C-alpha cells in the first residue's frame, strides 16, 4: 500500500468481506491503494438536478478500499506473487508466479 | 525572454463601444512602456497604433474560507486605430 | 582602529587604583580603588623624498626613523 502496489487493473477475489467472488480490478491509486472492484456499492439517491439524469441518483457506486483483497490467481486462486528469474536480455519480467502462475503478459489478458 | 507576446483583450463591456467607434482597450503586461505598447500593437496586429493610455488595478477583496486574499494585478491601457482598421476578428466577433 | 602605533601596537587597556602602605613596616593593606584607565605614547615626522610625515610611537619611533632612514 505505498509507491508499490499488489495486483493492478488485474483480477482476483475477496477473503474476509462481503463478496469474495473475484473480478474486475477496474483501477488502483498509487498511495492509498484505493482501488475499484465493480463489486459492492450503493446508488447515492443523488442530486435533484439533471447533472445526474433530469431525475438524479448516482449510478455505479463502487470505490473499493480494504486491502484484504484476495489478490491475483494463476491456475491457483488465493495467492501471493513472486518476482522473476529473467532468463532473457533486459528481462525484468517480474511475472506473477508461485503455485500456479499468472504473468499478466501484455497479450490475451491484462 | 524577448518574446513580444504581452496581452489579454479588454473584454470589458464599456470598452466595447470604443472598440466599436475606432479605438480599442486591452490589458497587458503590467509594465509595457507606452512605446513598448505602440510596438506590440503595431508589429502584432498589423495596425497603425495611434495613442495609448495606461491604467492599473489590483484585485482588492476576495475572502477564502478560513483565510482571505485579494487578487493579483490587472493592467489596462487603450490604443486607438488610425483609419478604423485591424483588431478585425476581435471586434467584428465581439 | 585609527590610533595604534605603526611600529607595533600600544593602544591599550588598564585596570588600576590603590590603597595605603605601612605594610611590612607596621601594617596590612589598605585597599579600595577598583578603577579603570588608558595608557600611551607620542607622534612626529620627517621625509620620503621632498614630501612625507612620520606618525608612529616614541621609542620604537627613534629606532624606526633611524631605520627607514637607512632606507
Amino acid at each position: 500500500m505505498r509507491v508499490k502496489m499488489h495486483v493492478k487493473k488485474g483480477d482476483t477475489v475477496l477473503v474476509a468481506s462481503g463478496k469474495y467472488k473475484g473480478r474486475v480490478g477496474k483501477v488502483k491509486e498509487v498511495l492509498p491503494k484505493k482501488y475499484a472492484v465493480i463489486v459492492e456499492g450503493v446508488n447515492i439517491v443523488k442530486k435533484a438536478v439533471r447533472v445526474s439524469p433530469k431525475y438524479p441518483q448516482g449510478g455505479f457506486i463502487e470505490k473499493e478500499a480494504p486491502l484484504h483483497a484476495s489478490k491475483v490467481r494463476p491456475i491457483c486462486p488465493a495467492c501471493g506473487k513472486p518476482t522473476r528469474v529473467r532468463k532473457k536480455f533486459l528481462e525484468n519480467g517480474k511475472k506473477i508466479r508461485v503455485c500456479a502462475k499468472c504473468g499478466g503478459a501484455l497479450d490475451t489478458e491484462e | 525572454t524577448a518574446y513580444d507576446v504581452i496581452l489579454a483583450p479588454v473584454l470589458s463591456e464599456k470598452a466595447y463601444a470604443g472598440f466599436a467607434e475606432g479605438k480599442y482597450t486591452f490589458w497587458v503586461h503590467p509594465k509595457a512602456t507606452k512605446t513598448e505598447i505602440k510596438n506590440a500593437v503595431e508589429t502584432a496586429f498589423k495596425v497603425k497604433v495611434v495613442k495609448v493610455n495606461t491604467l492599473h488595478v489590483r484585485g482588492k477583496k476576495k475572502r477564502l474560507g478560513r483565510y482571505l486574499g485579494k487578487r493579483p494585478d490587472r493592467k489596462k491601457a487603450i490604443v486607438q486605430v488610425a483609419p478604423g482598421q485591424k483588431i478585425e476578428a476581435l471586434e467584428g466577433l465581439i | 582602529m585609527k590610533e595604534g602605533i605603526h611600529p607595533k601596537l600600544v593602544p591599550a587597556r588598564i585596570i588600576c587604583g590603590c590603597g595605603n602602605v605601612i605594610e611590612t613596616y607596621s601594617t596590612k593593606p589598605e585597599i579600595y580603588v577598583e578603577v579603570c584607565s588608558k595608557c600611551h605614547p607620542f607622534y612626529t615626522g620627517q621625509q620620503r623624498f621632498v614630501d612625507t610625515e612620520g606618525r608612529v610611537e616614541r621609542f620604537q619611533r627613534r629606532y624606526g626613523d633611524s631605520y627607514r632612514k637607512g632606507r
Binding site: - | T1, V5, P9, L11, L90 | -
Partner: protein, 67 residues
C-alpha cells in the same frame, strides 16, 4: 512529443530563433482564445507552452556550447 524533441535538435540559430518566435505568437493567439473553444483547448495551453519552452531550452543549449 519526443518528436518535437527531434526537429528540435534539428534546427539551429536563425531558424530556432524565428521559429520559436512565430510559435510563441501562436500561443499568444491561444491567449486571445481564453474565452472561445476552451474545452479541447486545455492542451494547446499546457503543451504549446511546454513546446515553446523547449525551443528556448534549446537555443540555450546550442549557441550555449557555441560560445
Amino acid at each position: 512529443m519526443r518528436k518535437q524533441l527531434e526537429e528540435a535538435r534539428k534546427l539551429s540559430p536563425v531558424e530556432l530563433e524565428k521559429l520559436v518566435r512565430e510559435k510563441k505568437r501562436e500561443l499568444m493567439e491561444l491567449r486571445f482564445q481564453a474565452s472561445i473553444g476552451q474545452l479541447s483547448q486545455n492542451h494547446k495551453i499546457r503543451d504549446l507552452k511546454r513546446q515553446i519552452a523547449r525551443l528556448l531550452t534549446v537555443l540555450n543549449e546550442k549557441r550555449r556550447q557555441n560560445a
